[PDB]
């Protein structure tokens, strides 16, 4: 009856918001491109408070954390490639020959032995040097004259060879007065009212791995194998599937390469590819044929829920596009692999091996372009020795064509980050609350 | 006892959440947010630092102009206009949560903030006149 306003400071009520999220990492100390050394040390007690009785709305396709992480990683690469060598003197005429012929016909031009005149420490004296270059980094003139692939479109900057491309787990944290809400639902779609909800000061360890078609070293589902798209009935929205079991993949470049430094100026050194020690072999990836078929069947079962128990779905290879998107492109120990995936997506499944593995022939590039802008390209310096990385395929990036058929792709870097930030949501705290009660001042 | 944690009683009743306000009050300025290097992570963290103190003080500013400085539960002299919410006390504190309550009181939150503001200006003027003898 006699009710006055009563003010409460610290009321458990929040509103959706966009904020700046800083980075947290764990103690490991050289310096990765992700600059994880500059992040606040993560708490050894990753506190998670469960919000009983709460039911929050999520929408991974409007999430701001993925748009923020997309710009952060790009800025980390921009920040790391600023102080490194500009290879504009390399855009010169190249006299190229195949290196060590006689193997398997048109697989000898895949890597060339190119010699060229180069600036020295003295501005008035040239040097004739040579370097080994892959075929995907050179184009002909129309004679055996070649040039680097980027010379007409982009300037090129080689990465400072002391930096590490190895992804390091990044934790995203909201500032004080804000919060991160995680969706604990083990069969969560990506959108809609998530029943189980918990709050965290920081997100889990997210490795910033940029890969195509196949999502590597990511997180796994706890039940079934979810499939996430904003309009699955629309064929132009990428399907993001997420395995619960990891199908292992082994990639390698068996060629034992040597890095030869070339002084192109005062303080400037270009890291060329000396020669190949031992056999000139083919870089490739293995994946267990048994596990890939089993995991590809689970995707079929969950795809049935969106297209009918009777329909037939088929897997085909990429239908075109840029080289980065038509292949399983990724980074393995420094070099950028570009793996043919026609052997992984070549299956038709009906309405209703066991020993060997399926191999994937990969080509290798050194002059890789920036995905967003045009006119900006990086030179990956040559990695010495034999390369071999072992990682998990924990998801896919598929595409429907409109009985059913699904092919891979996905050149958008933020589709990678959606596969890890779908659980999280940024909200701001509003601790001021007014409510009636029979309490009066004085 | 219980101790649900930070926002642990977000789904509890308003009366039950009204007993764990220190749990949220202490995390409004701390966390993990020593040199200022202006890298991509350094600029990001600096903004995270200034943003926390900014929002923290804006709430303390309103809490000051209402005469509720350093209070978690202060009572006022602004009566409850039933047009704000005709719900009864028992169906408010033993029923609703603070989240859904703020959802329905949202229109009048700026109206109430003005009544608490001038009520404090006039109350301090009254206290000065009473101490003028």
């Amino acid at each position, epitope marked *: 009856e006699n009710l006055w306003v009563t003010v409460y400071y610290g009321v458990p009520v929040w509103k959706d918001a966009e904020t700046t999220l800083f980075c947290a990492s764990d103690a490991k100390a050289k310096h990765n491109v992700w600059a994880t050394h500059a992040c606040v040390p993560t708490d050894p007690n990753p506190q998670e408070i469960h919000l009983e*009785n709460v*039911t*929050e*709305e999520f929408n991974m396709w409007k999430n701001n954390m993925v748009e923020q992480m997309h710009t952060d990683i790009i800025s980390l690469w921009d920040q790391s490639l600023k102080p490194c060598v500009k290879l504009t003197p390399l855009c010169v005429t190249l006299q190229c020959t195949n290196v060590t012929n006689a193997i398997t016909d048109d697989m000898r031009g895949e890597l060339k032995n190119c010699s060229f005149n180069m600036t020295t420490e003295l501005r008035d004296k040239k040097q004739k040097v040579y370097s080994l270059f892959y075929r995907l980094d050179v184009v002909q003139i129309n004679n055996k004259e070649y040039r680097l692939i980027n010379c007409n479109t982009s300037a090129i900057t080689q990465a400072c060879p002391k930096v590490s491309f190895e992804p390091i787990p990044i934790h995203y944290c909201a500032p004080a007065g804000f919060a991160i809400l995680k969706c604990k639902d083990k069969k969560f779609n990506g959108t809609g*009212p998530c*029943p189980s909800v918990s709050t965290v000061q920081c997100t889990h360890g997210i490795k910033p791995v940029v890969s195509t078609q196949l999502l590597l070293n990511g997180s796994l589902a706890e039940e079934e194998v979810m499939i996430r798209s904003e309009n699955i009935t629309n064929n132009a929205k990428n399907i993001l599937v997420q395995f619960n079991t990891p199908v292992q993949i082994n990639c390698t470049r068996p060629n034992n390469n040597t890095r030869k430094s070339i002084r192109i100026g005062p303080g400037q050194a270009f890291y060329a590819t000396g020669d190949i020690i031992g056999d000139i072999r083919q870089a490739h990836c293995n994946v267990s044929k048994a596990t890939w078929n089993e995991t590809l069947g689970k995707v079929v079962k969950q795809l049935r829920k969106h297209f009918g128990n009777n329909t037939i779905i088929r897997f085909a290879n990429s239908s075109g596009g840029d080289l980065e998107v038509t292949t399983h492109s990724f980074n393995c120990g420094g070099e950028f692999f570009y793996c043919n995936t026609s052997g992984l997506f070549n299956s038709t499944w009906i309405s209703n091996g066991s020993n060997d593995s399926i191999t994937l022939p990969c080509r290798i590039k050194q002059i890789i372009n920036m995905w967003q802008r045009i006119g900006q390209a990086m030179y990956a310096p040559p990695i010495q020795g034999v390369i071999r990385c072992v990682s998990n395929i924990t998801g896919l990036i598929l595409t429907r064509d409109g009985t059913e058929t699904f092919r891979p792709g996905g050149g958008d870097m933020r589709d990678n980050w959606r596969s890890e930030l779908y659980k999280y949501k940024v909200v701001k705290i509003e601790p001021l609350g007014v409510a009636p009660t029979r309490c009066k001042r004085r | 006892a219980v101790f649900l944690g930070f926002l642990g009683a977000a789904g509890s009743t308003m009366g039950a959440a009204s007993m764990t306000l220190t749990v949220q009050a202490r995390n409004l300025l701390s966390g993990i947010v020593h040199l200022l290097k202006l890298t991509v992570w350094g600029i990001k963290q600096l903004q995270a630092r200034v943003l926390a103190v900014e929002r923290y003080l804006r709430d303390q500013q309103l809490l000051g102009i209402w005469g509720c400085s350093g209070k978690l539960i202060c009572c006022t002299n602004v009566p409850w206009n039933s047009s704000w919410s005709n719900r009864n006390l028992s169906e408010i504190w*033993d029923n609703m949560t603070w989240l859904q309550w703020d959802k329905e009181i949202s229109n009048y939150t700026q109206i109430i903030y003005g009544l608490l503001e001038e009520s404090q200006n006039q109350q301090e003027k009254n206290e000065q006149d009473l101490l003028a003898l």
Partner: nanobody, 128 residues
Framework: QGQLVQSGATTTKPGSSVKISCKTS????????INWIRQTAGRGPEWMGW????????????????RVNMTTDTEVPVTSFTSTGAAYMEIRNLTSDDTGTYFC????????????????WGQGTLLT
């Protein structure tokens, strides 16, 4: 708001065991108890029992102590504060003297002294 639609009003004969459903909407099904009330013609209206759609805890009268099974299945999040639920009712050593109209009503408040009190009722079902 809040709605509680009940099952059909079909009839059986003594010795059997019928199931009564109660489907909820417009409110969080977990936040309030679910009561079962009987309005017999040859007796005053009787409270049969309530159950917790959140904690599963049930409480029925000693007259129905070992004769009734009360069950509810987990809700379905519709919005942040809305969900759909269902409550079930069974009878064991059943006769024809248990004839009448049966209702389902949800609790009153989420806390206090009148927590489980039957507040919002259904349209009822006729029996044998």
């Amino acid at each position: 708001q809040g709605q509680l639609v009940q099952s059909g009003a079909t009839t059986t004969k003594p010795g059997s065991s019928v199931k009564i459903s109660c489907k909820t909407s417009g409110y969080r099904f977990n936040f309030y108890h679910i009561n079962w009330i009987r309005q017999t013609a040859g007796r005053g209206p009787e409270w049969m029992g309530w159950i917790s759609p959140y904690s599963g805890d049930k409480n029925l009268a000693p007259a129905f102590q070992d004769r009734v099974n009360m069950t509810t299945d987990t809700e379905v999040p519709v919005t942040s504060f809305t969900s759909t639920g269902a409550a079930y009712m069974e009878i064991r050593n059943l006769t024809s003297d248990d004839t009448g109209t049966y209702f389902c009503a949800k609790g009153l408040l989420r806390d206090g002294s009148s927590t489980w009190l039957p507040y919002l009722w259904g349209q009822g079902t006729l029996l044998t």
